[PDB]
Design a protein that fits this description.
The complex is a heterodimer of chains A (214) and B (212).
Chain A (H helix, E strand, L loop, with lengths): L3 E4 L2 E5 L4 E12 L3 E6 L6 E4 L18 E9 L8 E7 L6 E2 L3 E6 L6 E5 L3 H6 L1 E11 L5 E6 L2 E3 L3 E5 L9 E10 H4 L4 E7 L7 E6 L3
Chain B lengths: L2 E5 L3 E2 L5 E8 L8 E6 L5 E7 L5 E3 L7 E6 L4 E6 L8 E9 L4 E5 L3 E5 L8 E5 L3 E11 L5 E4 L8 E3 L3 E3 L2 E11 L9 E6 L4 E6 L5
Parallel strand pairs in B: 2-11
Antiparallel strand pairs in B: 1-3, 3-8, 4-5, 4-9, 5-6, 7-8, 9-10, 9-11, 12-13, 13-17, 14-18, 15-17, 16-17, 18-19
């Protein structure tokens, strides 16, 4: 019943930063029994770090050393973009074995603007009686962004579903998709469809639009 | 090379039962203590059960009496039998190989998702999204449970792909995936999105054809 509490729970740091994650145990854990794992989103965890006793030259293997305590750390000497992940500590000193709650590490980055594209409903969906209008806002940073849908110029946020990707492990950007879903009947009551993206890379919103009757 | 591959996950009703298997290859399976570790959606890792190479077993308190962990050393397979499933049991279940006494998990399976829910299996409707660099889309709408798999051109199109996490609405998931290719590749050569929804055995390919 040894509980592991990680701090911080999440952090953002620039490339090159020294980063240290703490794993605090509710009671003592042996140094050779505290492990770290890294997990990329959607993937299995991988073993990452463990600690061990080492014997100097000629020392017989019946000798070992360790430490006992409640404070353990993982350190990244210079944060890189591919280090985006959630890291977990685990102790196997006590039974049951336990994990910490995880620390999500994200990278700070140069502000970048989204690549925006808009797609009308496909004929297939329309024949089925539905109309989804899709907007991709790809490869931007920071992650904070606002999308407004306009229909013949008037704001519509009724029926909008948004989804953000995890941070990219190469470029450290984020992407988002926004989908406006209407009945086919409603879709045919308006002409122009617009998604406006408001991102810190300007006060002028980025706008992609089409007209249903063109 | 060493590999763990899970199967047997999917949708199950509360109170229902499910049996996970893990197939091990690339190492002498009998030698290693093996475990299951689970991860509920959006949450952290949690140890579930362990079985020594000596057959001795250990369980998380909250699955004691509902779950049974076992192994078939002749088939190089680990098993997890799950009965009396609760909503709290919904998670990705990982098989792991242990170093030494089994606690250092040095090899992991890819994981299999177990969804405990009353909602019905529903196949996805897949819609092709046609509009230097051209961006195409696939909309995968109205399915349950997770997961679906999305690839572009059976995997050959890997770079420039964003597949967005699904959103749940009224017991139905929807996701989308974009792909960006050179404007000379499309409509020049065929681009297709491949969608698998194994829960309903759905497998469909939708070629992206330009609009009239």
């Amino acid at each position: 019943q040894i509980q592991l509490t990680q701090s911080p729970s999440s952090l953002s740091a620039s490339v090159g930063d020294r980063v240290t994650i703490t794993c605090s145990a509710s009671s003592s854990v042996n140094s050779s029994a505290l492990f770290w794992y890294q997990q990329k989103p959607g993937k299995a965890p991988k073993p990452w770090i463990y600690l061990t006793s080492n014997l100097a030259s000629g020392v017989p293997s019946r000798f070992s050393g360790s430490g006992s305590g409640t404070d353990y750390t993982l350190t990244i000497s210079s944060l890189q973009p591919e280090d985006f992940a959630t890291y977990y500590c685990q102790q196997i000193s006590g039974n049951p074995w336990t994990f910490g709650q995880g620390t999500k590490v994200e990278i700070k980055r140069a502000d970048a603007a989204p690549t925006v594209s808009i797609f009308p409903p496909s004929s297939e969906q329309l024949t089925s009686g539905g109309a989804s209008v899709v907007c991709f806002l790809n490869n931007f940073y920071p992650k904070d962004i606002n999308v407004k849908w306009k229909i013949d110029g008037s704001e519509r946020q009724n029926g909008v579903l948004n989804s953000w990707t995890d941070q990219d492990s190469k470029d450290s950007t984020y992407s988002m998709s926004s989908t406006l879903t209407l009945t086919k009947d409603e879709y045919e009551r308006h002409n122009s469809y617009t998604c406006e993206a408001t991102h810190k890379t300007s006060t002028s919103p980025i706008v992609k639009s089409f007209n249903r009757n063109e | 090379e060493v590999q763990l591959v899970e199967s047997g996950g999917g949708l199950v009703q509360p109170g229902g039962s499910l049996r996970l298997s893990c197939a091990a290859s690339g190492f002498t399976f009998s030698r290693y203590t093996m475990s299951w570790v689970r991860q509920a959606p959006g949450k952290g890792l949690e140890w579930v059960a362990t079985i020594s190479g000596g057959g001795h077993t250990y369980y998380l308190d909250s699955v004691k009496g509902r779950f049974t962990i076992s192994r078939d050393n002749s088939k190089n397979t680990l098993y997890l039998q799950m009965n009396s499933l609760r909503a709290e049991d919904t998670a990705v279940y990982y098989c792991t190989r242990g170093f030494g006494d089994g606690g250092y998990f040095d090899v992991w399976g890819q994981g299999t998702l177990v969804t405990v829910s009353s909602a019905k299996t529903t196949p996805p409707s897949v819609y092709p999204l046609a509009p230097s660099m051209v961006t195409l889309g696939c909309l995968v709408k109205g399915y349950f449970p997770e997961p679906v798999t999305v690839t572009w051109n059976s995997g050959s199109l890997s770079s420039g792909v964003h597949t967005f996490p699904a959103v749940l609405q009224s017991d139905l998931y929807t996701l989308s995936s974009s792909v960006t290719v050179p404007s000379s590749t499309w409509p020049s050569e065929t681009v297709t999105c491949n969608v698998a929804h194994p829960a309903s055995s759905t497998k469909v390919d939708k070629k992206i054809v330009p609009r009239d």
